[PDB]
Design a protein around this ligand. Sequence first.
Ligand code: HEM
Length: 463
Amino acid sequence: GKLPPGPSPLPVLGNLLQMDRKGLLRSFLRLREKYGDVFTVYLGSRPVVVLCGTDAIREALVDQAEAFSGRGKIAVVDPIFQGYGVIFANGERWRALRRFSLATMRDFMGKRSVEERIQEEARCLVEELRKSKGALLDNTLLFHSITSNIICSIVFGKRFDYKDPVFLRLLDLFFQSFSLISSFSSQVFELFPGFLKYFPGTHRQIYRNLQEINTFIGQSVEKHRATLDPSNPRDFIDVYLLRMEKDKSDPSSEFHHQNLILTVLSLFFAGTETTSTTLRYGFLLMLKYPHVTERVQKEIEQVIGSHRPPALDDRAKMPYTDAVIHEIQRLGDLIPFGVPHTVTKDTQFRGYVIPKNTEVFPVLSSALHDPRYFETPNTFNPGHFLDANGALKRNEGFMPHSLGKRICLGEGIARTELFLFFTTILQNFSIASPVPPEDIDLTPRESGVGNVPPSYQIRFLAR
Ligand code: HEM
């Protein structure tokens, strides 16, 4: 049959000349108004089926879950990952890695739970912020550090002190790669990769930094193997090393060294930046709307008090705080175009045929701003997640972690980090900044990865 409708492309530039300079998101919104919720666009010579609106996204990712469960390539990082690791794998390799990862992170190993690790990280964070004594800070580094430390706890069985210089050198290297992957020069590399990969550019810096991180990950794996107690696995690496030994004879097995290194690197890639940025965005909103922040603090005081630290069971009793977090994620809209998918076979969708391995973009932003589900889509409104009796309510438009078979693997971990970090910080500190609330601008910069909140200063004032 045929592909969904769309603008007429050019030989090598596809529809790039027809794009809007305001961003890809604005262009898709204009293209939606002309062709509907599902359309085809050529970014270079690459055909992409774009899904707009809650319906088209749910029909694809949920109703034909298996058909839309493929993962599309990110060219700037494909030389490192090469289809290994949980985020970039496909087929049987993906199924085995995802099953194993889910179980390991869920049905753990180690001593303490993920929640207990997050509570300990939150306690360390409070002590570090107390030491600041209300000085102006840029919270980017600390929020990168706490989220990295959660992943470290899971994969390496330990956390790092916030001032550990070797931890900070590799962290800087990792987050620089993130800023580079998302730059305009990397966006251009994604459009004309086969050509641009022969000249100097950000792709070389990304590659060098990640090979350095992979070297460190490799050394940790060897060190885990040399100090291994098979009856007491400490973390993800130990559990994976035991599975490698169990599958030693099976040559079909995916449980090898490359999948280990790149699965660990994948967890840092997926599990740090978005969580950190959600926190950064949330604190910016809390500066802009002090009456919301005040109300969260009142709810913390009523349910938790000022003595004990927040625990995950407290969330069920704090619908206002829970609604605020949902609204931070919704308005934050940090992954506006989703993470690219592909169809795993020639697929029939709304009368069209999407050929096998065609790339698909589920535009999560169009669900997060859907006027069917949100009364004031462009305005911060916790009421979007509260019913007339003040209880938390479910919303079909709320999909910041996507849907279907590729749904965010760490959703439960991320949601727990948001709850415990926001409440533990606010239980102990009030916030201020040199910019008056009325002058705070929440407009993001659209980057390669997603929406980047502006940089800002903040004070954490002990209570
Ligand atoms: C607020 C924080 C976060 C948000 C909004 C978020 C969002 C997402 C989204 C939109 C996807 C793409 C799903 C798709 O292909 O349709 C994704 C994938 C994924 N996320 Fe998250 N994520 C966050 C935190 C994390 C955390 C903390 C971890 C790990 C501990 C994590 C692990 C993953 C992995 C491994 C995948 C790939 C899933 C797969 O290909 O099977 N995420 N996430």
